[PDB]
Design a protein around this ligand. Structure first.
Ligand code: CDL
Ligand code: UQ
Ligand code: PLX
Ligand code: NDP
Ligand code: SF4
Ligand code: SF4
Ligand code: ZN
Lengths: 63, 115, 54, 96, 144, 97, 342, 208, 176
């Protein structure tokens, strides 16, 4: 009927994410700024979450 | 209160009881898995790997999360027992073809920009 | 096709002579047409049975 | 109008060429390098300039619906020829 | 009803230029049919047609025995037909290039090339973009 | 086709039908591979005068669904989702195959 | 450091490791492991092949798109060697034939070809050169194999002063000739051993360890002019080694002593095969010879490698030789053989 | 309004609204909201505890019979406290009508399996568990159905990456297929396509 | 409106019963099947003599990609990147910069033929008829790397197949 758990919610063990991408990542919670090229404000309504940028290199073939 | 409903276990003790049952089942199954799959690891290697996977998430203090983990463990045990899993699936627990990533600061600084 | 350039692209002969047609072709082939919010389940009689999409 | 790098490698229209020390040239050994010989810039420079008796002329690249979108070019500037944004053809208003 | 069949067979034998030509076309094309010569290729291919046959067998080609650089008496492939005869042969049009020649351009290839895979002329991909970041070159003058 | 008449008779007797009347292979009744150019008419909204877009905007006439019985907020005959489906008829063309 | 040769990525399949290797003899037993380890890190591997291209097909999946390039070469042609190492910053030499051939005797394989490779690599500006010789390489050795190995090692050192030289000892693996040779002997009923193999000590080394040692020697800046001895952790008598090999395969072991002249005569008769020989007099000499001990040379532990004992990676080689009855037998029910350690 | 706009049907809207009110009155303990979309589709929002009673009533009642289950899926909205949204799509052969039943769930609360009510649900619930991680209480045989053996994580979730966390390749040293961390040759390119101007004024939300 | 498919019963008169017994004991329908197969034995096979004969195609057929030019020789592509934005498989990669004479042209134009799905959306989105899907389909390669086309390969394809691509576009541009 009711167990009345008294623990902080934590589902890191059920999501299947490697600990490298849990203990090290740094999300960023923000409302995106308006694109200065335009005057429309319809892209500044909802909050967004994104992760920190990691390395990108040039693949030897095709660049 | 919190208006939460359990999956299987009311408290931590039942969850623990189920964890021990799952551990016994896996401990029993390891030798048969080694024979059937024709693995090149010893039974001690399989059993201490099972122990390490059990201890990997020994910090959980929520009975519902523990029940879900036990359910997933039983699913994997059932896949192992019925031979649905192949040799590659069993050996994926050992990461035999991955270079050991360093954990100290100096080697991480030497290799790249990723902390 | 539906004679509504905000959903279906205009003809190639009008995209190259009309400004509105070129703008609509551009915005249809880069961004696409917006669909009003909602949910539907439409099912047809496919050869193998009832094929539907939610 | 292809050139040749000091290493004997052809230079493309873009102009990318491997540096003497670039190991990526090994992919061309026992094989060839794909280079298009019809350079667009020279071919469009070879075209003559059209003389028209209007301050504004239109271009669609030739072929009507088989060309580019029709644009209008202003020819009021005397020391410069109007150039089509799409086709690259040049036009001028008669002088001298 | 039967002697006529044998006579058509012997006429097919005769129409290829004797027994040697009949054997050549039998061992090269696995077919000894005869048809009207629509036209002959720049590289040596000969194109025939026979409208009495059903759709798909009313247009064929006898490939040349020597392409740009390789001997092609035995190893023929469908990549040797030039684009105009490619369009005619695949039933994309009703008119051969001998009747409706393609438009001429200064940039169009004057010598068709077959599939060059597996040969030293194969296409090797590479990046066409220049360098992104230029580095700092230290001076050659000693500082003390 | 081009088969011998005796072979034609053998085929017709072996199959039970007249194969000559219907042939799977196509010889000369299909359309020509080269066709005259088309004209392709325009459509209903290609007018110049009575063609304001706000009067033919299908996307802008959609509205959020009608909420009936929000929980937060006599006869009463029982009602069905739709009238019962009518019994099908037995194919006057060919009822039994 | 030639920016296009700067390491990038997490060291995976699509990374860049800054290594442009030319693995000579990559279509062999050690070559496949070396190429696999090079391609794991994202290195560029140039594979010079002389065999049928069908025989290099197993190397294709070992690298990403365009990271493995196959070129044809000739051992006696210097221009092909010039072509295949012109763009490499490291050259690995694994060329070697166990049995002498009509067109390539031991001098051609172990002396002339390595010397030519070293000379052309030095003339081409190649920075690193890894050369593989034998642990028992001796100039007074009764085996032409090891005499040629020593002469070629000296010539390579003379032509490429900064060359790294590696001396493994009887590498064992899945495709390894050494483990299989003993297993193959069961067909002849008994196992002919000179002096019952009671006066021959062997120190075999695992193939993965040798490949990892080569890879770590490529990336070690202070291993230019060094010479390494890659040997296993344990030393075994030949009799006990063969007994363990037959016990793992679950085959009846019937050894018997055979005199040196008879064994040599037997080897000579076999040598007449126009194909690859089953055994030769040279193989006879090498297999009944004690492995040299060289404490003055570095080893796998000096490159970070912990040598894998034979008792851990022997079942993966010898399970193929079991019958159906014993095919499913486990690994740790064999009671490992006795080691004469010091 | 004639040629390009879809034609609205008044009769079906009234019928569906009347039946929605009927079902709402019969089951006040579980039904939380009833909607009829303007393309004539009826939706019923219920409480998670009422999955079995509502489905049993809709399958067995004389007036409304929905013997056939057309679909059963889940929708993931991370911004809601109850993350997942279970959708049941039924079809009535007797009355030639369709109904939709919705409920909600989070990562840890289980939902009663509807296998007893519908045979078709046994596979659908397996797929929901496999892709979203929603546990169904009394499922006779609950396990992964579509994903690989020993596959960690649930693919149909907003947080989960498009290309996953591991990728497969064959390694000649170990002579088997091995899984290693994903390292794409070319990264997927993310496009920002939303227009900064409002398209449909009818769905504008209050600015609080 | 419905019809039954297996809802007929056989007549039990002695003539029909004897006919059924004769069918059972003498395999009449089996002989009918043999006769049908023998009938097809004597027809003309529908096999074409590839590679000397090719199956029919249409001007709308989508084959290998190509980059076209204007009659003057200038490339038609202007680096508008519509084809890259519309590609369902993300197979097109484009980079651009002003040319030496100020034209808006590409410096990189790669199409991954192993990611491509040959849907033709790219030649629909292009406003200047620059990228097209030519009629070639026999371009199998022995290595994966040969199927990663760059700008030079596509321009060579256009130069090689223009004589047919222009004719194909002429025969169908009125339907677009
Ligand atoms: C049978 C006994 C021999 C006579 C025979 O085969 O004739 C069958 C001939 C087959 O007719 P068909 O193939 O239906 O007619 C198509 C034309 O003949 C189509 O004529 P075609 O232009 O294809 O003729 C090519 C010609 C030349 O073909 C060849 O030389 C290559 C094939 C040689 C096969 C041997 O075929 C022959 O001369 C060989 C005919 C069969 C010889 C046996 O007609 C009959 O003789 C019927 C006889 C009773 C059969 C029951
Ligand atoms: C993997 O490497 C190796 C091989 O590859 C496959 C070999 O074949 C090989 C040699 C083994 C041979 C293939 C022998 C196989 C067959 C035997 C010779 C049995 C035949 C012996 C007699 C004919 C028995 C008949 C009765 C007699 C009295 C005569 C060796 C040593 C080896 O090492
Ligand atoms: C025990 C009995 C058998 C003994 C061995 C002989 C057996 C019979 C051998 C018969 C050989 C027939 C095959 C050769 C046919 C040639 C046809 C020709 O096409 O081949 C060409 C190549 O010919 C080959 O060079 C011939 C191979 C045979 C060479 C001689 C073999 C002699 C064998 C002797 C065996 C014993 C030797 C002595 C020591 C034992 C390549 O053809 P290809 O391009 O594909 O075909 C094109 C297909 N098209 C039309 C669709 C385009
Ligand atoms: N294997 C062992 O137990 C030990 C090996 N070594 C040394 O390691 C190296 C390789 O070991 P392994 O790979 O097991 O031996 P392999 O015979 O398996 O490797 C043979 C390689 O050498 C090439 N090769 C042989 N002769 C020639 C030639 N005349 N011209 C060109 N290429 C040739 C082969 O090419 P192809 O096959 O196409 O002819 C093949 O790539 C050798 O130098 C060997 O002496 C050292 C100690 C022990
Ligand atoms: S055909 Fe389709 S998938 Fe292929 S490049 Fe063009 S748009 Fe992309
Ligand atoms: S090919 Fe066409 S659509 Fe693509 S970038 Fe060039 S002009 Fe634009
Ligand atoms: Zn123009």
């Amino acid at each position: 009927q009711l167990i009345a758990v008294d623990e902080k919610l934590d589902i890191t063990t059920l999501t299947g994410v490697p600990e490298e991408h849990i203990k090290t990542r740094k999300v960023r919670i923000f409302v995106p700024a308006r694109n200065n090229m335009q005057s429309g404000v319809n892209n500044t309504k909802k909050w967004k979450m994104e992760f920190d940028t990691r390395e990108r290199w040039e693949n030897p073939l095709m660049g | 209160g919190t208006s939460v409903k359990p999956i299987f276990s009311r408290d931590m003790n039942e969850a623990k009881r189920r964890v021990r049952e799952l551990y016994r089942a896996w401990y029993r199954e390891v030798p048969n898995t080694v024979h059937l799959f024709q693995l090149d690891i010893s039974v001690k290697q399989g059993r201490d790997k099972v122990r390490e996977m059990f201890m990997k998430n020994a910090h959980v203090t929520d009975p519902r999360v523990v029940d879900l983990l036990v359910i997933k463990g039983k699913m994997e045990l059932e896949e192992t027992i019925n031979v649905w899993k192949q040799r590659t699936h069993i050996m994926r627990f050992f990461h035999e073809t991955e270079a050991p990533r360093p954990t100290d600061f100096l080697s991480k600084f030497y290799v790249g920009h990723d902390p | 096709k539906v004679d509504d350039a905000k959903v279906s692209p205009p003809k190639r002969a009008e995209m190259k002579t009309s400004m509105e047609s070129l703008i609509h072709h551009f915005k249809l082939y880069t961004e696409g047409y917006q669909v009003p919010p909602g949910a539907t389940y439409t099912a047809i009689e496919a050869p193998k049975g009832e094929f539907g999409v939610y | 109008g292809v050139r040749t790098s000091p290493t004997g490698e052809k230079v493309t229209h873009t102009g990318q060429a491997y540096d003497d020390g670039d190991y990526r040239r090994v992919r061309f050994s026992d094989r060839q390098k794909e280079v298009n010989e019809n350079f667009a810039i020279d071919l469009i420079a070879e075209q003559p300039v059209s003389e028209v008796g209007s301050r504004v002329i239109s271009c669609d690249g030739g072929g009507g619906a088989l060309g580019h979108p029709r644009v209008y070019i202003n020819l009021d500037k005397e020391t410069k020829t109007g150039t089509c944004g799409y086709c690259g053809l040049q036009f001028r208003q008669p002088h001298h | 009803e039967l002697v006529q069949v044998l006579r058509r067979g012997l006429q097919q034998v005769s129409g290829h230029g004797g027994l040697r030509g009949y054997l050549r076309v039998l061992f090269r094309a696995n077919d000894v049919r005869v048809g009207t010569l629509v036209g002959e290729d720049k590289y040596g291919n000969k194109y025939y047609e026979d409208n009495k046959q059903f759709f798909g067998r009313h247009r064929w080609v006898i490939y040349t025995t020597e392409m740009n650089g390789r001997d092609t008496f035995w190893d023929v492939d469908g990549s040797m037909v030039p684009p105009e005869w490619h369009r005619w042969l695949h039933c994309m049009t009703d008119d051969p290039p001998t009747t409706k020649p393609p438009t001429a351009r200064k940039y169009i290839w004057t010598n068709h090339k077959f599939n060059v895979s597996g040969t030293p002329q194969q296409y090797v991909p590479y990046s066409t973009t220049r360098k992104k970041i230029q580095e700092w070159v230290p001076p050659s003058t000693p500082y003390k | 086709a081009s088969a011998t008449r005796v072979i034609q008779l053998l085929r017709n007797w072996a199959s039970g039908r007249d194969l000559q009347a219907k042939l799977q292979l196509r010889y000369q009744e299909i359309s020509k591979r080269t066709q005259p150019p088309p004209k392709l008419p325009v459509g209903p909204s290609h007018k110049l005068s009575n063609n304001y877009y706000c009067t033919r905007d299908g996307r802008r006439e959609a509205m959020p669904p009608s909420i009936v019985m929000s929980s937060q907020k006599t006869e009463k005959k029982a009602v069905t989702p739709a009238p019962p489906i009518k019994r099908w008829e037995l194919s006057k063309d060919q009822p039994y195959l | 450091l030639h920016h296009a040769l700067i390491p990038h990525g997490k060291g995976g399949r699509s990374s860049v490791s800054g290594i442009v290797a030319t693995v000579f003899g990559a279509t062999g037993f050690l070559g496949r492991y070396v190429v696999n380890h090079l391609g794991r890190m994202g290195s560029q591997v140039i594979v010079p092949y002389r065999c049928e291209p069908y025989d290099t097909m197993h190397l294709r999946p070992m690298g990403d798109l365009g990271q493995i390039i196959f070129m044809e070469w000739n051992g006696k042609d210097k221009d092909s060697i010039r072509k295949v190492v012109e763009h490499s910053n490291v050259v690995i030499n694994l060329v070697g034939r166990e049995w002498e051939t009509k067109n390539f005797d031991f001098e051609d394989v172990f002396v002339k070809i390595p010397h030519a490779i070293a000379q052309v690599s030095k003339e081409a500006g190649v920075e690193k050169l890894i050369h593989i010789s034998h642990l028992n390489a001796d100039i007074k050795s009764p085996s032409r194999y090891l005499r040629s190995k020593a002469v070629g090692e000296k010539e390579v050192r003379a032509a490429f002063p900064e060359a790294t030289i590696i001396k493994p000892s009887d590498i064992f693996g899945r495709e390894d000739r050494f483990l299989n040779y003993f297993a193959s002997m069961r067909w002849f009923g008994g196992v002919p051993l000179i002096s019952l193999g009671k006066e021959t000590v062997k120190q075999p080394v695992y193939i993965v360890d040798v490949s990892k040692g080569i890879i770590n020697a490529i990336k070690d800046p202070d291993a230019k002019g060094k010479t390494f001895a890659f040997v296993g952790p344990n030393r075994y008598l030949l009799f006990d080694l063969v007994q363990y090999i037959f016990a793992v395969a679950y085959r009846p072991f019937l050894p018997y002593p055979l005199p040196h002249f008879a064994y040599r005569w037997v080897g000579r008769l076999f040598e007449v095969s126009p194909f690859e020989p089953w055994t030769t007099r040279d193989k006879v000499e090498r297999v009944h010879m004690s492995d040299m001990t060289l404490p003055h040379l570095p080893g796998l532990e000096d490159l970070g490698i912990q040598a894998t004992p034979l008792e851990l990676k022997a079942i993966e080689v010898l399970r193929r030789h079991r019958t159906y009855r014993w095919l499913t037998s486990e690994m740790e029910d064999v009671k490992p053989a006795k080691t004469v350690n010091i | 309004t004639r040629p390009t706009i879809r034609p609205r049907n008044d009769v079906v809207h009234k019928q569906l609204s009347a039946f929605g009110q009927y079902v709402a009155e019969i089951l006040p303990k579980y039904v939380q909201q009833v909607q009829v979309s303007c393309f004539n589709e009826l939706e019923i929002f219920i409480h998670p505890d009422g999955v079995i009673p509502v489905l049993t009533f809709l399958r067995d009642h004389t007036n409304a019979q929905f013997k056939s289950l057309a679909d059963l899926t889940a929708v993931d909205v991370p911004t809601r406290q109850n993350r997942f949204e279970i959708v049941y799509n039924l079809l009535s052969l007797r009355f030639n009508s369709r109904i939709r039943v919705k409920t909600y769930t989070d990562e840890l609360t289980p939902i009663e399996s509807s296998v007893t009510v519908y045979k078709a649900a046994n596979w659908y619930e397996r797929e929901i568990w496999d892709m979203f991680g929603v546990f169904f209480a009394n499922h006779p045989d609950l396990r992964r159905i579509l994903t690989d053996y020993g596959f960690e994580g649930h693919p149909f979730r907003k947080d989960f990456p498009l290309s996953g966390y591991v990728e497969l390749r064959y390694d000649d040293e170990v002579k088997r297929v091995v899984a290693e961390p994903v390292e794409l040759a070319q990264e997927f390119r993310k496009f920002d396509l939303n227009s900064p101007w409002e398209a449909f004024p009818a769905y504008r939300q209050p600015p609080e | 409106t419905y019809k039954f498919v297996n809802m007929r019963e056989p007549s039990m008169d002695m003539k029909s019963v004897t006919d059924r017994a004769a069918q059972t004991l003498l395999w009449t329908e089996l002989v009918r099947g043999l006769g049908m197969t023998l009938s097809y034995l004597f027809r003309e096979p529908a096999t074409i003599n590839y590679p000397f004969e090719k199956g029919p195609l249409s001007p709308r057929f989508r084959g290998e990609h190509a980059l076209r030019r204007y009659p003057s020789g200038e490339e038609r592509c202007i680096a508008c990147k519509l084809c890259e934005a519309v590609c369902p498989a993300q197979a097109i990669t484009i980079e651009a910069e002003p040319r030496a004479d100020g034209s808006r042209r590409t410096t990189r134009y790669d199409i991954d033929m192993t990611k491509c799905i040959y849907c033709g959306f790219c030649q629909e989105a292009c406003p200047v008829d620059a990228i097209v899907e030519g009629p070639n389909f026999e371009f199998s390669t022995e290595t994966h790397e040969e199927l990663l086309y760059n700008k030079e390969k596509l321009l060579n394809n256009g130069d090689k197949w223009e004589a047919e691509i222009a004719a194909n576009i002429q025969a169908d541009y009125l339907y677009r």
